[PDB]
Amino acid sequence: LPGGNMQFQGVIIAETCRIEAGDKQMTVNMGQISSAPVPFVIHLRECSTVVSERVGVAFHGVADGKNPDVLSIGVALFDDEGNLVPINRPTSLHFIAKYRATANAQAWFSLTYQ
Amino acid sequence: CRIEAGDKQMTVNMGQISSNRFHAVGEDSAPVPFVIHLRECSTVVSERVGVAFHGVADGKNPDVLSVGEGPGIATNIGVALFDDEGNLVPINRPPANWKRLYSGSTSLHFIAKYRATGRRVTGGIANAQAWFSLTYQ
Amino acid sequence: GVALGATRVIYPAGQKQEQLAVTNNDENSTYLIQSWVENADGVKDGRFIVTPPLFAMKGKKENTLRILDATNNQLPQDRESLFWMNVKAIPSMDNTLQLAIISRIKLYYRPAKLALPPDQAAEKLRFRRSANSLTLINPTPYYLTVTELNAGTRVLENALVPPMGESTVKLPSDAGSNITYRTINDYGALTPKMTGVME
Amino acid sequence: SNRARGYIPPELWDPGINAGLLNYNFSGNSVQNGNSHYAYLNLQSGLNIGAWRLRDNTTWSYNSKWQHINTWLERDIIPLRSRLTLGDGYTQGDIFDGINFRGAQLASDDNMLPDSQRGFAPVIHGIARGTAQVTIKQNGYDIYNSTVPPGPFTINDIYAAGNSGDLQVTIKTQIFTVPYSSVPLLQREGHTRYSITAGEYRSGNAQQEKPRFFQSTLLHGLPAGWTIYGGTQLADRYRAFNFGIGKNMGALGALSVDMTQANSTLPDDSQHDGQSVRFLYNKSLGTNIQLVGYRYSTSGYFNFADTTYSRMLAYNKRGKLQLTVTQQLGRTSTLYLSGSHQTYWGTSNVDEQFQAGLNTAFEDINWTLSYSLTKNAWQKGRDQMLALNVNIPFSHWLRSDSKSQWRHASASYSMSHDLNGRMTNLAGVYGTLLEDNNLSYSVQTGYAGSTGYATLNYRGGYGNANIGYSHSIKQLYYGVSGGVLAHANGVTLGQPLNDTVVLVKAPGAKDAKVENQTGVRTDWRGYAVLPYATEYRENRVALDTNTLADNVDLDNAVANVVPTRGAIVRAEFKARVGIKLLMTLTHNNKPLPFGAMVTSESSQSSGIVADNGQVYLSGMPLAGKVQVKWAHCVANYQLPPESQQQLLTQLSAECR
């Protein structure tokens, strides 16, 4: 005996990629000062490739009184290539922290989703 | 044994599911239950029934339903139906799990979930249509 | 750890509030989540209220932030409005450099009565080719985002054309005549490839 | 010592609460020719004390008496990952034939195991020379990808992909394939199931007697895909023993073979020995799915149900053959053929059943053509039927995101041809009407005589109510179903329950819809009952802030539960009632330090100062002061009489 038609409704929505770091606590151990390369990796998982690729990366923080491009001696950040990454500017990323002569600092890694 | 007239035309809403809920193929979303009622059933003729679900099978997996193709339609996602015991029932096949009958009223429960048949999940509407048939002993 | 439930938010006009899911899947970390609403140009505004503005969470846990509107129906009802929603995830700690994660997404204040369908708005975009620039003009009051902008055999940078306005992008002289583009629906899914019509 | 993906440790399972349970389902039918009234009330009582689930089913009938149908007690044994159903029940019937009974039944439960370790999935071995990563490829999909330390590795959490194909083990570098095919009788290596059962025998047929039997089935897996399954069905006058083996050949497919030998004592006091051999072959693959099943039984072989008849059904089955061929045309069309052939002993009667069908789906329209052919020598005729079904949603013509309520409506057209008798054409509109889609209209009219069926199902926060009218004979169906949960804090009403239930406790917050539910709303007291919850998994229960009252706020709107089967799991939410206010608090003409804590004194609330001293507080009265800790301060405040009317109150507060 035939039964009856049945309908299933539902919608799927994309979401922000989960963002974490290889080092726990979102803390980088720069070490005591006396320059010193401290590498740390940021991971973007738990999302689709299109969403992961269509992002915008920027850095924010307190600018040093002498050098606004150096996070408040100071801490500088370099990418894989080795180019200097200025702060306050418009799946695994490795960034190297260095000590620059001009101690706790805080930085804002900002990801904008298109 | 006649089915309830209301059950012959029912719609089940799965709500909204986060895409990253499906990392790899085979994972399932939040289950949603639905029931089918059989009334005035007589056990003299038969005491056992089974349910067969005929529908459009997906292109990459013939065990789940299809969500269609077109703009604004989720891809690599299908609808999977499971029995009350949690075992997968292959759609578009004769019934495999059989249930007993009680004189008067009988209720059959089933579960609907979202199954990922692709590496990546694309958002959008994932509506589907199927139907059920009863096979008596 | 910290994750939002949607890449974009749609707020219908007259709605009392909207919910947004924020989740974390780490059992041994404590996170302080702070939120606020920015305008199109990136200026702090009180037109929207995030509740809670700042709250702490521990372990595997998910919460819902409520977005309230105090604009008092001042935004125009003839077109959509754009806002930048920011979610800051402060890791509660107990030489070290601390990092915070700021996720920025788009919130579209959409009026009640609209002339054009949101899905149909994608294909109504128009293009103009200057000596070295491509101008995208939108005859729809809907916000439109262009992705995978192929000019011949090469791609170009993404653009955010405003409703009832025009946007300009670069265009190499050696780029092919054909123009192809993709748009994003309200669900964050790329629309099927559509050819570029010239006017 | 790696664990399965999505593993739940055996400590987060909630035993539940010591609570009662009632499920009422009253159905009445008024048939007018007539004016005959039928009532089929059903009551399902239940109790949860400790970790024991007591269930009772009783049906009251009426025509214009009570019948105790079922009664059992269930207890889940975690160390054995099994369940003991002390009382009434029935056998699984996976190996033998399912039979109702009343007695002890200790059976392994697969739901205890994680979702990854389910179905059939070959274990992946191999020694990794140096550090490397392994990827599983199937139909161009990375099934699993993770780093592996040097040395031998074992993978046993592969998802039950089903038919699919072969798994390419891309290690980073021996690239080798592993065949993969499964049948319902195939199990992963190491996985074990058992269904020990003892007690009396019961059945619906009154002629059948009530003997005492012992049924025990054991299934085990061996390396290289072997699966060995045995079983015994010992009884006083019936002895059946089954032995079988299943193997995944791979490219050839999957084959399961079993043989059952049975000695049966018929009511004629005659002993009969018989055998039954069953083959099950499954093959995948553009894609042509083939399923073949054969069951050949020699004369004199009978099931345990055949020897239970009264002291002092004649023809016996000889062979059952089943063919199922599925071919997919394109990415849209699916054609299926199914055939069942029956042979007996001493006669040429064949009960043939053939079902062919084609399903196609357009962007919106979904249409299907099916043909059925039932041949039975008892009736000396071949019933042939042709059925065409078309489903068309109204969104095809309606504009996208339309404000009309018709956007959820859909149309169905059905054509039925007997090719030798009366035809039928039925057209009907079905959809939802209420704000939360709790309504369901199914109004259809057709010609065979005119047949008009209109149902107005409704799913409220107290119970489900269905009213239907059938005109041909004027029948009227009415039905009220619901459930009553008696917990420690009181009694609540809601929709009919299904196994596990979640009692959400929101004291002071009333009329709060829950997310991803069919209009389940909290009562005036605040409690609510979810109809269903997943067993031994992580759930997600959330409250809709939009439906939340304007004077109520939730600290943690979303929670997660891990409910044991048949356990009433109580999830609580702290609801703060009062005025929501964002205070700009300043201390010594300066904003308070970031991260300082604020605790209410009049009420129980806490908050963070955050930036610019903008602290958000909920449930606060019209006056009073709080304590700010960063180092202690107090700040009294006063509110206008319209503060309650205003959704959010912004005031400038001054510290000590």
Author numbering:
A (entry chain I): 8 to 41, 52 to 89, 100 to 117, 129 to 140, 149 to 160
B (entry chain B): 24 to 160
C (entry chain C): 1 to 94, 101 to 205
D (entry chain D): 121 to 153, 157 to 187, 197 to 304, 310 to 422, 426 to 452, 476 to 611, 619 to 642, 645 to 802, ...
Question: What do the study authors state?
Answer:
To explore the structural implications of FimI-mediated termination of pilus assembly, we performed a FimD-catalyzed assembly reaction of pilus rods in vitro similar to the one for the FimDHGFAnC complex, except that excess FimICHis was also added at the end of the reaction. Since a ten-fold excess of FimICHis over FimD was used to ensure saturation with FimI, we also observed non-physiological states in 3D classification, such as complexes lacking pilus rods due to premature FimI incorporation after FimF, or complexes containing two terminal FimI subunits (FimDHGFAnI2CHis complex, maps XVII and XVIII). Given the low FimI concentrations in the periplasm (FimA:FimI ratio ≥100:1), we focused our analysis on physiological pilus complexes with a single terminal FimI subunit capped by FimCHis.
